[PDB]
């Protein structure tokens, strides 16, 4: 999901 | 529990929340298409803003996605309301996008009423960043998150005491601000309903991130 | 107005004496079994509770001074919130269950058919009220706050009047906490905690609301039809 | 309105 992609990276 | 929030003093907390502030984005060049495009880009900044909010990182990942899934529209709205304070009767979505209600309109009026209230209360920027951090952490649903909320509460009070407000005025103003959060929760829930119906009607394409945060309300 | 002159102790007594009663359900043991009949019990219960709430609202200090249209408006906006905080209050002494009525005690297995998610939010709200040891004096203050605040942001100095009364209830809450023996820090912390829960109450209300005009076969009373249509259109 | 008529009495 885009959320925990921006949330990690 | 490892936490930066519980280690910060009142002024250090304010300083950190100020430095973590997201930028005021511009609209591109239908109306709801513009707002959708704008909100989508704002969401990207919000995610990184949240990571800069003291205490948020120290939460588990699943708790982090949960709060953001719950609060994202609340945070967008209070930001909009904040920007529109010096424009009574209008909403400043962007420096190049100042709108009146007749250009979803029921939600527009609720935002206008919130902006007018903040303006006559003379809401300060240091109080504003405290309210946003509260919204983010109170959207989910002593617990760690409740301990942080207690500290941001101490921060709001600390700010008001420095402003020169009496103890009575502090408790009253604190109540005034937190009661507005209830109305912000209302606008967010109503906006969420209309945005999903908007998806069903296929009239303006919600972005990937927006579609995702929408599916979360569940 | 006159409610701007009453003291904190007088505000509490006025609210305690205006308190609506805890009503009973329709008793028949077969109706909680299915979905339609169960919502029928809750609907009937809420309808009778509304009649008490309306007359309770008239005794809320400051509400009487409001114009007729403002009175209807506030009730139209906060009716489900007030029902829920009452429900949450009654359910404190019963963890894991929701006490809609003394003869209607609901467990979450009943909520897992037709709703489970809202059920848990109400449980969690009642849970926090319990471990905070919410007092009856504090509770009636929170209800009055909901009544006056929820619909105020939808010559217009009647808004100012509403805010003035709200400030008084704030003073009252602090007064109660001060008498209870809480330190200054604990006071504004507890005050914040209680008011943050009002956002949760608003949330659960909006979620429950859209189920109600989605459930709209399970006959709704005309009064209840009137309260929901105000939230729709 | 019924709510209106309930406030009326
Ligand atoms: O897909 C979306 C479209 C609009 C909104 C939005 C809404 C609030 C305003 C009303 C506008 C009525 O015209 C509708 C929704 C919003 C946009 C930017 C912000 O910074 C804050 C909020 C969010 C997502
Ligand atoms: O027609 C109605 C049906 C139910 C409710 C209601 C609701 C409770 C929670 C949800 C749970 C399922 O969704 C349903 C609505 C309620 C009823 C009485 C109370 O004292 C408090 C609330 C009000 C009117």
From Swiss-Prot, chain C:
| Segments crossing the lipid bilayer | none
Domain notes from UniProt: Composed of three domains: a modulating N-terminal domain, a DNA-binding domain and a C-terminal ligand-binding domain. The modulating domain, also known as A/B or AF-1 domain has a ligand-independent transactivation function. The C-terminus contains a ligand-dependent transactivation domain, also known as E/F or AF-2 domain which overlaps with the ligand binding domain. AF-1 and AF-2 activate transcription independently and synergistically and act in a promoter- and cell-specific manner. AF-1 seems to provide the major transactivation function in differentiated cells.
Within the intact protein, the region shown is 305 to 549 of 595
Mutating residue 96 to V: effect?
Destabilizes the receptor and decreases its affinity for estradiol at 25 degrees Celsius, but not at 4 degrees Celsius
List the source organism.
Answer: Homo sapiens
Functional summary from the UniProt entry: Nuclear hormone receptor. The steroid hormones and their receptors are involved in the regulation of eukaryotic gene expression and affect cellular proliferation and differentiation in target tissues. Ligand-dependent nuclear transactivation involves either direct homodimer binding to a palindromic estrogen response element (ERE) sequence or association with other DNA-binding transcription factors, such as AP-1/c-Jun, c-Fos, ATF-2, Sp1 and Sp3, to mediate ERE-independent signaling.
Q: Which family does it belong to?
A: Belongs to the nuclear hormone receptor family. NR3 subfamily.
Lipid modification (S-palmitoyl cysteine), residues: 141
> What is the phylogenetic placement of the source species in the record?
Eukaryota, Metazoa, Chordata, Craniata, Vertebrata
Region (Self-association) residue spans: 1-233
User: What further note is attached to this protein's record?
Assistant: Selective estrogen receptor modulators (SERMs), such as tamoxifen, raloxifene, toremifene, lasofoxifene, clomifene, femarelle and ormeloxifene, have tissue selective agonistic and antagonistic effects on the estrogen receptor (ER). They interfere with the ER association with coactivators or corepressors, mainly involving the AF-2 domain.
Q: Which disorder does the record name?
A: Estrogen resistance: A disorder characterized by partial or complete resistance to estrogens, in the presence of elevated estrogen serum levels. Clinical features include absence of the pubertal growth spurt, delayed bone maturation, unfused epiphyses, reduced bone mineral density, osteoporosis, continued growth into adulthood and very tall adult stature. Glucose intolerance, hyperinsulinemia and lipid abnormalities may also be present.
Residue positions, PTM Phosphotyrosine: 221
What is the tissue localization of expression for this protein? Widely expressed. Not expressed in the pituitary gland.
| Residue numbers spanned by region Transactivation AF-2 | 7-233
Name of the featured protein: Estrogen receptor
Residue ranges of the region described as Interaction with AKAP13: 1-233
- Where would you find this protein in the cell? Nucleus; Golgi apparatus; Cell membrane
Residues annotated for 17beta-estradiol binding in this entry: 49, 90, 211
Query: How this protein is processed and modified after translation, per its record?
Result: Phosphorylated by cyclin A/CDK2 and CK1. Phosphorylation probably enhances transcriptional activity. Self-association induces phosphorylation. Phosphorylated by LMTK3 in vitro. Glycosylated; contains N-acetylglucosamine, probably O-linked.
Boundaries of every NR LBD domain copy: 7-231
Q: How does it assemble?
A: Binds DNA as a homodimer. Can form a heterodimer with ESR2. Interacts with FOXC2, MAP1S, SLC30A9, UBE1C and NCOA3 coactivator. Interacts with PELP1, the interaction is enhanced by 17-beta-estradiol, the interaction increases ESR1 transcriptional activity. Interacts with EP300; the interaction is estrogen-dependent and enhanced by CITED1. Interacts with CITED1; the interaction is estrogen-dependent. Interacts with NCOA5 and NCOA6 coactivators. Interacts with NCOA7; the interaction is a ligand-inducible. Interacts with PHB2, and UBE1C. Interacts with AKAP13. Interacts with CUEDC2.
């Amino acid at each position: 999901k885009i959320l925990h992609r921006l949330l990690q990276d | 529990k490892n936490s930066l929030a519980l280690s910060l003093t009142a002024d250090q907390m304010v300083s950190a929340l100020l430095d973590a502030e997201p930028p005021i984005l511009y609209s591109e060049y239908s109306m709801m298409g513009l707002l959708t495009n704008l909100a989508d880009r704002e969401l990207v900044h919000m995610i990184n803003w949240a990571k800069r909010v003291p205490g948020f990182v120290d939460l588990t990942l699943h708790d982090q996605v949960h709060l953001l899934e719950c609060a994202w529209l609340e945070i967008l709205m209070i930001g909009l309301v904040w920007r529109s304070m010096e424009h009574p009767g209008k909403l400043l979505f962007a420096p190049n996008l100042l709108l009146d209600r007749n250009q979803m309109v029921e939600i527009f009026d609720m935002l206008l009423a919130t902006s007018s209230r903040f303006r006559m209360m003379n809401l300060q920027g240091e109080e504003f960043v405290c309210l946003k951090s509260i919204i983010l952490l109170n959207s989910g649903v002593k617990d760690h998150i409740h301990r942080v909320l207690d500290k941001i509460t101490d921060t709001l009070i600390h700010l008001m005491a420095k402003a020169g407000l009496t103890l009575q005025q502090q408790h009253q103003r604190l109540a005034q601000l937190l009661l507005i959060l209830s109305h912000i929760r209302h606008m967010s829930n109503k906006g969420m309903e209309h945005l999903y119906s908007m998806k069903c009607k296929n009239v303006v394409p919600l972005s990937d991130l927006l579609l995702e945060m929408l599916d979360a309300h569940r």
